[PDB]
Amino acid sequence: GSCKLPVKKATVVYQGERVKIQEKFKNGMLHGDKVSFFCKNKEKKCSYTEDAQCIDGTIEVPKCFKEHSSLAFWKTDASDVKPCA
């Protein structure tokens, strides 16, 4: 079974490449599909990835994920921050 987009906007890693999930999966994800979302470590100010997989028509987004806000122009999206070591 197939999953609907779990979020509105996010850059994720799909098969090694960064894509906008809303663009690359504009028509849903297929079973087995796997992406990595980006989350922030706000103490070390670096980003880390958390994988999420479409399993029987459901894809659970990691709890640390935060949706992009166009209004928050002073905030850096997790994907744009230096990666955690």
Residue numbers in the entry: 243 to 327
Task: Reproduce passages from the article.
Beta2-glycoprotein I (β2GPI) is the major target for autoimmune antibodies associated with antiphospholipid syndrome (APS), an autoimmune disease characterized clinically by thrombosis and recurrent pregnancy loss. The binding sites for anionic phospholipids, lipoprotein receptors (including ApoER2) and GPIb are in domain V of β2GPI (β2GPI-DV). Circular β2GPI can be converted to an extended form by altering pH and salt concentrations, binding to a high-affinity antibody directed to domain I or by the binding to cardiolipin. β2GPI, which is abundant in plasma (about 170 µg/ml or 4 µM), acquires its prothrombotic properties only in the presence of anti-β2GPI antibodies. Anti-β2GPI antibodies create multivalent β2GPI/anti-β2GPI complexes that have pathological properties compared to pathologically inactive β2GPI monomers, which are normally present in plasma.
